[PDB]
């Protein structure tokens, strides 16, 4: 299909038209897109307002044994509208409650029930205790108890560390000596085979006597 291939096939344009499409749209994508008109936010859905003896007659045509709580609020997909007072108007949610509002204004007693809010066992109040900082404070607390444990006997340990460093330095320092002296006497012998008679002064070890080697 060319719509997949993204061709603009509009009829004002080239004369073609997209083949898989409905030939009539009663509301196009823009006015489907506007949900403010469709849904009831901030909008009145019943446009006539009844007098007192009208409201009383309208309430009088409700069958007894009826609760308001049996009429769930329709989802967002469903258009919000009220057909006014028709037969079986109490089945209409928005009509029910709009009438309820007129009955609140006109001072008409409301015979039906009122809307119930069902709640669970585990529900929390609106001003709800915080878990984030309680968490941060308790786990931090845990870290510093650990620090209190780990720091016991720290100063002595840190005293021995320096001694171990000095020892590790000293041993290899004094081994280097015995290495280099046998190296340099080997080089003294390897200078003495080639017959170079090396004086005592130009030797770095200046009390050295080569005849003793």
């Amino acid at each position: 299909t060319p719509m997949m291939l993204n061709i603009q096939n509009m009829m004002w344009w080239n004369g073609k038209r997209n083949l898989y499409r409905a030939t009539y749209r009663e509301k196009t994508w823009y006015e489907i897109s506007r949900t403010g008109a469709f849904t009831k936010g901030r909008r009145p859905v019943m446009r006539q307002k009844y007098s007192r003896e009208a409201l009383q007659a309208a309430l009088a045509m409700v069958p007894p044994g009826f609760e308001v709580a049996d009429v769930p609020r329709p989802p967002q997909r469903i258009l919000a509208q009220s057909e006014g007072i028709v037969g079986r108007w109490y089945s209409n949610y928005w009509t029910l409650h709009s009438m309820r509002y007129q009955c609140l204004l006109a001072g008409v007693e409301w015979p039906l029930g009122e809307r119930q809010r069902p709640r669970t066992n585990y529900d929390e109040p609106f001003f709800f205790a915080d878990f984030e900082e309680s968490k941060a404070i308790r786990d931090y607390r845990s870290r510093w108890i650990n620090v209190n444990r780990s720091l016991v006997g720290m100063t002595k340990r840190m005293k021995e560390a320096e001694e171990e460093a000095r020892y590790m330095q000293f041993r290899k320092l004094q081994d280097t000596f015995w290495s280099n002296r046998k190296v340099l006497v080997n080089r003294v012998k390897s200078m003495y085979n080639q017959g170079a008679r090396t004086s005592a002064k130009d030797m770095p070890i200046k009390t050295i006597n080569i005849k003793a080697f």
């Binding site: 993204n6 603009q8 009829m11 004002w12 344009w13």
Partner: peptide
Amino acid sequence: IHKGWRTWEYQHTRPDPRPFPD
């Protein structure tokens, strides 16, 4: 439609076909 034409700048009216009918 490797590249889409700018079709938003035209008002909708059908142009006359250039090989115009007699």
